[model samples]
Target: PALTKSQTDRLEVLLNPKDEISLNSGKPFRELESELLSRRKKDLQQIYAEERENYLGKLEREITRFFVDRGFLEIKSPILIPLEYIERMGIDNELSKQIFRVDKNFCLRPMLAPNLANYLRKLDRALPDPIKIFEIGPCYRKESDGKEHLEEFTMLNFCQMGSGCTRENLESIITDFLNHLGIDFKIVGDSCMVFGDTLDVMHGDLELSSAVVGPIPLDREWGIDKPWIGAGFGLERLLKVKHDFKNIKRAARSGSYYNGISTNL
Candidate 1:
């Protein structure tokens, strides 16, 4: 049987209960509408942070501060860049198929490494020893699914280039960064097409970040010979894993929810 407008509205509110559902006396259809709306209003009012921005922004700010205090220079790189940088990053033909393209020469960045690689290579000779840098920004890919993945998501990429970059120090940096967030995580051995064998940071099956120590074969393609530690984390995934969110989009950019409140609620 087809549901009337009020019936559907009540059903929606029921399915998307942000807080505990009320057990008020059963009433007529017309009378139930106001109660449903009032319940939704209560749910919305109880939320302290609207959407993920308020919390995400605070995290971004604190992360930047954490790195800067450790002598890491934060780079504000362009979100769009030449396709050649990605090629230099050693993205195989198979992986390139999933990248987002804007034109023949340019594409929306899928990760922060391409730009960070440029800075590392160009400033290798001029920057201070054990040059430390990081960038936290949005990255785009041609992804369409996966509860933990998003087409557009923020990345937290940090690197320590030149001398003093070692496997131990890299792990230390990863620990310190996660520690700053009060996140309890562990590192595991893993491999990747771009970085070869890697140390993946995990909270259960969810990978919060990937860390790789360089002087690897890929460095030759970028015209450099230095030990470095490169680690990248998805801010959305971090929030999802930490908070046990059912959907990553809830912790990402969305039009349907504000401050974690569903608009239709």
Candidate 2:
């Protein structure tokens, strides 16, 4: 029989009777007692959900506003891009195999470089030199869904191009950006499969972001005629390291409930 509205309300109350459920005690074996315990668990889960949103929302606002304050134009790029664009950025056989193909000629973008470089090429002379731009969106790849990596993830790609955009300039931007969050990180030499020589921002062994300074051969090949410095950050990795989460999935979009909240509670 379908439960009446009052009955459902009572059921929810019974399961969640008191806000606190003690783990020090043995499990509640009785049916109604178990429901009561579960209600508390679910209640805690809801609190976790809300707090997670609060934390992430604040972080997102901080990062986006930081870029805005620095005169960066925020752009919303498509999740999908032409295969040729990916190829132009040196997405070779190994990398191509990991692309999440949408069709024969298009696939979900794994990085923001190709599209953003195209943007730079088109706006070559239109925008002021040292054009500052950033994009925040999801990028996809065919990778193992696990603690450190997700198939679908969020990235913040910020770049400044034309004269005077150098490695030091990129480092300064990244340093101030991380410092704004009060996160302790180190800028170290690194390399990207796509971007070639790069600088990585690291919190311990995990990389929060990578930056590239270019009179890049790749950019010139794409018809962009200026030096540039750009960085792409994995937002989830930032959150994970910031809070010391056991797994990065806990800070990212996932199938698990109450991802950003403490599970122990």
Candidate 3:
């Protein structure tokens, strides 16, 4: 016989065909299973609505408040950006192939660094030294299937530019922020093609954030001359680590739980 919700709801699969079931054994177990399903359903619904009362929702507010309280100007950049912006960042040919271009002139941004850096250059002229800014939004990339990789994900990029932006200062800022979140992490020295010798933020075995301090030549390409330091973090990855989620996708923007597993089952 085919299994139905009635059978599964009572966790009949946990029993055998020849195994006799009783009210004491099956009924109480069904209530427990039903209760669990209800909790998952409610939580998933709350997240879907982007309610301010949920765990991820609360974290978003706390993160924004932390940055704002520290004098970081929260900013928004367009999801679709001009093609030249990506080129200015020195994205290599292989990585460039993953870009999601909408038209000849524009593509969905893979990262916020280039656009934020460009803004810093303009803001520098009018603002005081050490311009502080941050942006939080979605970024897209064509990525391989993995527990930790997402094709579309939210990112938080915070930067400070101009004088007094040193590696020590950047490390201190990152440390304080993580501390405020009560997250224990290790700072490891790493290098990427676009940003070299980065201070990567690792939690357990997962890397959630990467920081770079620059007086590098890439700054010159964007008409920036001052030293700057910045970091980009995947918010979903942070949530994954914080809650010890089994799947990173569970913490990401998804309309269904585990891509419909819970719903179907």
Candidate 4:
């Protein structure tokens, strides 16, 4: 059902659901609906950092295990990526300014595919078609403030190269990841992954991809004809569903938030 005008207006309060406001933005994050409309301006980015550091550590290992068991090699590349490298991957413009530049050249890596491709190029033999690779790491951007968007965040990128892996194969792996977490979701394939029905309205004419792992969406603000294709699961979004907290910061506390809240109640 479509949300009534009043219900639609209230989603802001629901998402922020907090009284504390960051000094960077005057109002509580909930009030920044107008800004949260784009990934470039998303503010809840810090939550992403926490997940990448703590939760992602375990998640990455497990995901790597799955790929290894399935005969895939897990490759790690330098975070200080070269400019031409990203340009080759078609990320030169959107990711160029966002990187932390060093000397007269070099920039913080914004995505893993460029480095992955580099590794593939160095291999002695052509990789068996449909090589499955996954990377979990931090990505940087230039913009500083958005209620839900951060200049930096973690991405769980899994790519299957070669015709051996059909798109369905890629999607099945994603579904397995989400099922393990018990998240209730639906799959819709277009440009990227879409979440709930409500998520469709989060932006206009957007694209999405779904996996057992999660959803991948194109950052429309990049304004590129072809934006990055991968999942950007908001760690906070998962934390909220997995645990109950009086506020967002509570995600820092150890143990399951959902379990803790249920016990307290």
Candidate 5:
């Protein structure tokens, strides 16, 4: 007898792990299943040994070096922020709410914009032309579906303030950053509810980042007076696209897996 549909699906999943392994066998389905299971256990040991920790933390250090080398200030902003800012960004509600509220007027921030805005607004003009700053931190959002969504994920928020704030400058900086990361990307012009226009960065079909070159009315709400280029990226998604993760959760916080290896031993 041949492998049933469900059995074939299970075999496919076991065979298609993120870490490559040799599982091909001429043995029958019933006999092969046990052998594959055994192989998986052995593979986990190898994978876990090589991958000691999550890659995102390491990414923060590596990418931080890239920004710091380019004269950008690293800011460790608060994870919890005022809900008033979320309302200004226009993501407060949509029949179903996405903001994760922790207190009456405070919530686990969904993006890094408001924090960067606060920094830019209060920034001293004497600093120099085109001030640069960045932050790599965790963020939260309510998920409607489990697939392609992570409620708690890391973000790489960066910005350039003052002179050279045109879209041309924004595009060049984005290209330099992505190219240095060795990522193949396309910049697409798109509209945003809060900012009106944005240049969305993509790695194939997946969006890697969203950016806006400003002096727009929205900036006034945050007390920002100068022109700027602000961008926000999901760090886990960057890892996902580079590492080819089957599930985004494997690249995020999980007890089910450690460093993208299944812990179901």
Candidate 6:
């Protein structure tokens, strides 16, 4: 004889939620098979949205406050940029493949640094010494699916130019800001260290490299003024370090203590 209608329904539920639901042998079969067990799986987008907001908001305020304290102007630039900037100017070739061009007019910005550098070059004559500025906004990149890297992501950038914008000054400001954030960390490896030796050797292009990725060697035979140092943090990584939360999703959907409150911050 075929299984009863209830038994068949229970088996179907098992197909979807067996992994998430715990079964108890003593309980009645029907009670063990509640509808909640077969609902659609949860997506973490909402929690990620909140975390992204909190992450960006706090980061902007933190960085801006640092810049402004040091007499810098916080500038907001256009998301829609001229194609010339993306293709013809600066290190366009490195970013060329990732650019999303629109007609003859526009492209999404991949990095704020080059644009800010260009802007500073234009303003150098008109503006006074020690020009400082900060920008926070979305950046677009062409990425393939793997560990959930995206084609678009937000970025926070701080730029300082002119004679007084020395290497020491840049690091001092960065150290001040990060120190205030309480992430007391240091560069982990050295010359003899096997893990990061390649990173230590290649030197440039660390901007694009992440902790999980090794540096892609670029030709440094060309003469260029490489910056002294710069560091960018990933908020997702930051959250992983700072909080003891299960996942970003639970942090958004429920108002429970584990979740974040956006309007307050």
Stretches of model 3 off by over 4 angstroms after superposition: 1-57, 258-265
* Candidate 1 collision pairs: 50-259, 51-258, 51-259, 51-260
Q: What are the RMSDs of all candidates, in order?
A: 4.2, 7.7, 6.4, 12.7, 3.1, 10.0
Error of 2 at 155 (Å): 0.7
Estimate candidate 1's alpha-carbon lDDT, on a 0 to 1 scale.
0.78
Best-to-worst TM-score order: 5, 1, 3, 2, 6, 4
TM-scores for every predicted model: 0.83, 0.79, 0.81, 0.53, 0.85, 0.55
Of the candidates shown, which would achieve the greatest lDDT relative to the real structure? 1
Off by over 4 Å in 6: 1-53, 89-94, 145-148, 187-240, 244-265
Comparison by lDDT, 5 against 6, better one: 5
Please give the TM-score that candidate 1 achieves against the real structure.
Answer: 0.83
The lDDT for every candidate, in the order shown, is 0.78, 0.74, 0.78, 0.45, 0.78, 0.47
Q: For residues 7-116, could you state the per-residue lDDT of candidate 2 as single tens digits? A: 44444334321245443244423444455646657766776676545545566777889999999988888888887777778777776787888879988988887778
- lDDT-wise, the better of 1 and 3 is 1
Task: Tally clashes: model 1.
Answer: 4
Model 5 per-residue lDDT tens digits across residues 64-112: 9988998889999999998777878755465127788877998898888
Residue 71 displacement (Å), model 4: 2.9
Best by TM-score: 5
Q: Candidate 4 or 6, higher lDDT? A: 6
lDDT tens readout by residue for model 6, 87-110: 444343534777888788788887
Which candidate model has the greater TM-score, 4 or 5?
5
Q: Once model 2 is optimally superposed onto the true structure by TM-score, how far is the C-alpha of residue 5 displaced, in angstroms? A: 39
**Candidate with better TM-score, 1 vs 3:** 1
lDDT of 4 by residue, 149-186 (tens): 34555555555544434445555665676566666556
lDDT of 4 at 53: 52
